[PDB]
Amino acid sequence: AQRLQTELDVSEQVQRDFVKLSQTLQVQLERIRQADSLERIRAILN
Amino acid sequence: NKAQRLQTELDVSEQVQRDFVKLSQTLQVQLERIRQADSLERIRAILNDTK
Amino acid sequence: KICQFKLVLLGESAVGKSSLVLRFVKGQFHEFQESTIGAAFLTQTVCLDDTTVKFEIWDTAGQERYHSLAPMYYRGAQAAIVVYDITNEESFARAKNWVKELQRQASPNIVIALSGNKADLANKRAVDFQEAQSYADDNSLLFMETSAKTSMNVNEIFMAIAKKLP
Amino acid sequence: ICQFKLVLLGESAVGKSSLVLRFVKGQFHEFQESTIGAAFLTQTVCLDDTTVKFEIWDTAGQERYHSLAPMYYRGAQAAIVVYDITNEESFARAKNWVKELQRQASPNIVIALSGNKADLANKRAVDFQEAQSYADDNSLLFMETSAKTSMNVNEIFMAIAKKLP
Numbered sequence: 314a315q316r317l318q319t320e321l322d323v324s325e326q327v328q329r330d331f332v333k334l335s336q337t338l339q340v341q342l343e344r345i346r347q348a349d350s351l352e353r354i355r356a357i358l359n
Numbered sequence: 360n361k362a363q364r365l366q367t368e369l370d371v372s373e374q375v376q377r378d379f380v381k382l383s384q385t386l387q388v389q390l391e392r393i394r395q396a397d398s399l400e401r402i403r404a405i406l407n408d409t410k
Numbered sequence: 411k412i413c414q415f416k417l418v419l420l421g422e423s424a425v426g427k428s429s430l431v432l433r434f435v436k437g438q439f440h441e442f443q444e445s446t447i448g449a450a451f452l453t454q455t456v457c458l459d460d461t462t463v464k465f466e467i468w469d470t471a472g473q474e475r476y477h478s479l480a481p482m483y484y485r486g487a488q489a490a491i492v493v494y495d496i497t498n499e500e501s502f503a504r505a506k507n508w509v510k511e512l513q514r515q516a517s518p519n520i521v522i523a524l525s526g527n528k529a530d531l532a533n534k535r536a537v538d539f540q541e542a543q544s545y546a547d548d549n550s551l552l553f554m555e556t557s558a559k560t561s562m563n564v565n566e567i568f569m570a571i572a573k574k575l576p
Numbered sequence: 577i578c579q580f581k582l583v584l585l586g587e588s589a590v591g592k593s594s595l596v597l598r599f600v601k602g603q604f605h606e607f608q609e610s611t612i613g614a615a616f617l618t619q620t621v622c623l624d625d626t627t628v629k630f631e632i633w634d635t636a637g638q639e640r641y642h643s644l645a646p647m648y649y650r651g652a653q654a655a656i657v658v659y660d661i662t663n664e665e666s667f668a669r670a671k672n673w674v675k676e677l678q679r680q681a682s683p684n685i686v687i688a689l690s691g692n693k694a695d696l697a698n699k700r701a702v703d704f705q706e707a708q709s710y711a712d713d714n715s716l717l718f719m720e721t722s723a724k725t726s727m728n729v730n731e732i733f734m735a736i737a738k739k740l741p
């Protein structure tokens with residue numbers, strides 16, 4: 314129906330929110346894995 | 360034909376959505392663990408766990 | 411004795427969930443907090459006297475699109491805080507629906523807390539304290555007005571959850 | 577002095593996560609689990625007189641994730657498209673990934689073609705020359721690799737870094 318389409322849109326909008334969110338978390342984890350000391354690390358977690 | 364392939368496209372959408380929700384939850388628990396880690400050697404172990 | 415558990419914050423967007431958590435956990439308050447995407451996770455260990463209590467805290471994005479996901483955060487939670495803006499009657503009714511949902515979906519044992527946040531903004535209070543108190547008493551909900559801005563009753567409500575937790 | 581985002585694409589099970597594991601950690605796993613969503617690693621290697629950082633996104637290649645690939649390769653300076661030299665279907669699938677990038681990715685993207693699992697030449701279902709020809713006609717950087725034996729893994733990456741503007 315008309316609503317099934319709008320339902321899909323909302324669905325895919327949230328889906329993309331969490332894709333983006335996961336991309337950020339993974340980049341942050343990666344920077345942590347490259348971190349040399351607890352200094353840099355706590356800096357990244359900020 | 361219309362509302363057919365559209366119901367499925369939704370379900371696959373919802374399935375991907377949940378994958379990425381579980382993915383983010385796992386990553387966040389791990390960033391927080393790391394935030395709580397005492398030593399740098401503790402952090403390597405966390406980064407090496409499972410997801 | 412170690413007792414850690416899972417707690418979830420629920421409520422309409424922009425009522426102060428994250429702020430509230432930032433307060434409790436990192437003792438901060440950002441005036442221009444940006445809307446949460448999806449959800450945020452933080453932990454916090456607080457001792458009652460003899461036993462250590464670890465808070466596993468899920469601060470959910472409140473906007474309506476994320477509604478259907480909420481279970482993936484509160485399922486298997488032993489505590490919840492439903493928050494609303496005392497200067498917003500619509501955010502108080504929305505808060506009522508979160509309570510009904512938890513009562514239907516979540517474990518019967520879950521400790522639910524109701525937060526009337528932004529008490530510091532009583533300059534334009536749109537939700538009478540006594541009406542919010544009453545609503546709470548009937549649903550057996552730990553109610554408490556709070557201010558993430560001034561830290562009023564922030565630590566208490568968390569602390570009050572831990573004690574009421576079985 | 578130079579960091580660039582690179583993305584891997586290919587049909588599920590062609591070797592993409594293994595390829596990146598090799599290049600990044602020298603590892604390889606006979607039983608790598610299928611990727612969920614996407615994974616991210618970096619690698620800083622000094623060209624010859626300048627350090628270049630690889631920001632590498634390793635996408636899940638299952639069909640249900642297809643609509644999402646754009647969200648990884650938009651803004652990418654480089655892509656690797658991977659197929660299994662023992663899987664004719666995976667090669668066909670790679671052709672359309674290339675097509676999709678040519679139409680939708682940045683116009684100056686460097687696209688590499690990886691004939692992966694070339695260590696299993698004993699079951700070659702994809703003629704190396706049938707694939708070398710396709711790559712030349714599409715201006716791709718074709719190169720058969722093995723994540724198991726590490727063959728051409730550093731090369732392909734280094735060829736990409738080289739050809740980048």
Ligand SMILES: Nc1nc2c(ncn2[C@@H]2O[C@H](COP(=O)(O)OP(=O)(O)NP(=O)(O)O)[C@@H](O)[C@H]2O)c(=O)[nH]1
Pocket residue numbers: 421422423424425426427428429430440441442443444445446447470471472473527528529530531556557558559560
């Ligand atoms: N005066 C005052 N302002 C507050 C209080 N709590 C939050 N705010 C303000 O309200 C706004 C939104 O707060 P925020 O914590 O982001 O809300 P939220 O409930 O997490 N929003 P969402 O659900 O969209 O993520 C911020 O600008 C913040 O400064 C409070 O106790 N007092």
Ligand SMILES: Nc1nc2c(ncn2[C@@H]2O[C@H](COP(=O)(O)OP(=O)(O)NP(=O)(O)O)[C@@H](O)[C@H]2O)c(=O)[nH]1
Pocket residue numbers: 586587588589590591592593594595605606607608609610611612635636637638692693694695696721722723724725
């Ligand atoms: N013989 C051989 N097997 C390989 C090679 N590279 C990967 N494999 C094998 O192929 C299988 C799948 O590898 P994997 O890296 O997970 O594939 P993928 O393309 O990432 N799959 P997905 O897209 O689902 O995440 C594994 O059993 C792995 O060991 C290679 O060069 N040679």
Ligand SMILES: [Mg+2]
Pocket residue numbers: 427428429444445446469470471472
């Ligand atoms: Mg928030």
Ligand SMILES: [Mg+2]
Pocket residue numbers: 592593594609610611634635636637
């Ligand atoms: Mg993979």
